[PDB]
Design a protein around this ligand. Structure first.
Ligand SMILES: CCCCCCCCOCCOCCOCCOCCOCCO
Lengths: 79, 80, 79, 75
C-alpha cells in the first residue's frame, strides 16, 4: 500500500483548511514575546489537559509548542 | 493577559478539537494498524515521501505526520 | 553531495546520547511521573529551564523532553 | 520530586547550550542553502539513520538542525 501518505496529506490538508487561519489570528491576538510565550504555553496546556489527556492532545500541544516558538521568533517584540 | 487571558482559552479548546479529531479518525487508526514493525523507519520515510509528493506543505500535514509517527512509535514500543 | 551532513549529525547525536541518555533514564525514573501529574513536572522543568535565558537549543531540548516524558508515562504510567 | 526536576532542568540547559554552541553544527547549518530545504531534511534524515541506529541524541540533533533550517528561511 502506498496511499497511506496520500491519505495523510488529505487528512492533514483538512486540518490545515479549517484550523490554520484560525490559529494564525489567535496567535496574533496573543502577541507572544520571548518573555511571556512559555507562560501562555503553560496556561494553554493546563486548560487543554483539563478535560483529559489523550495522545492527540499531547501531539497537538507539542506541535503547538513549536509553532508558538516560530511565531515568537518571527513576530516577537510585541508585533 | 500575562498569565491568564481569553485567547489562551480559545487556543487550548482549539487544541482539544484537533487532538480529539486525530484520536477519533478511524481511517488514521486503521492506517497505523495496517503498518508492520518489520522495518519501522522505512515505513515512515516512504509515507513522508508519498505525503509530500504533491509538492504541497502546511501545518496540518505536520500534525498528521507527527501523530502518525508517534503512534507508530507507541505501537513498536508496546507491540514487538 | 549532502552525505557528510547526515553522518556528522549521527556522530553528534550519538555523543549526546552516550553521556545524557543514562542520566535522563534515571531522573525520569526517580521522578515517577504519573499519567496524571506529568504536566506539573513538565511545567516546573520548563520554568527552571527558561530562567537563565531562552535560546533555540533550549526550546528544542524542551519540546523533545516533552515528547520523551509523554512516551515515558504511557509506558510506566502506573500510579 | 523537585530534587530530580531541577537536575532535569540543568541537563536541558546544558544540552540546549551545547547545540547552540556546537560550531560543527552551526557551520553545517550555514553550509545548507534555502534553494530546496525540506528535501535536504528528508535526505539527511535517511543518511543519518542509514546505519539503522536510533536514539534520543540523534533525534534532538536532527530536530535542532531541521528547526534552525526553518529559522534561516524565516529570516
Ligand atoms: C514538529 C513537532 C516537533 C516535536 C518534537 C518531537 C521530536 C520528534 O521525534 C519523533 C520521533 O520519535 C523518536 C522515537 O525515538 C525512540 C528512541 O528509542 C528509545 C527507546 O526508549 C524510549 C524511551 O522514551
Amino acid at each position: 500500500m502506498g496511499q497511506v501518505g496520500r491519505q495523510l496529506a488529505i487528512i492533514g490538508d483538512d486540518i490545515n483548511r479549517r484550523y490554520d487561519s484560525e490559529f494564525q489570528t489567535m496567535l496574533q491576538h496573543l502577541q507572544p514575546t520571548a518573555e511571556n510565550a512559555y507562560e501562555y504555553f503553560t496556561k494553554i496546556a493546563t486548560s487543554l489537559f483539563e478535560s483529559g489527556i489523550n495522545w492527540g492532545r499531547v501531539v497537538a500541544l507539542l506541535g503547538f509548542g513549536y509553532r508558538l516558538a516560530l511565531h515568537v521568533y518571527q513576530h516577537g517584540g510585541s508585533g | 493577559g500575562g498569565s491568564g487571558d481569553a485567547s489562551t482559552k480559545k487556543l487550548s479548546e482549539s487544541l482539544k478539537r484537533i487532538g480529539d479529531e486525530l484520536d477519533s479518525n478511524m481511517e488514521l487508526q486503521r492506517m497505523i494498524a495496517a503498518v508492520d514493525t518489520d522495518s519501522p523507519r522505512e515505513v515512515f520515510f516512504r509515507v513522508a515521501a508519498d505525503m509530500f509528493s504533491d509538492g504541497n506543505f502546511n501545518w496540518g500535514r505536520v500534525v498528521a505526520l507527527f501523530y502518525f509517527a508517534s503512534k507508530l512509535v507507541l505501537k513498536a514500543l508496546s507491540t514487538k
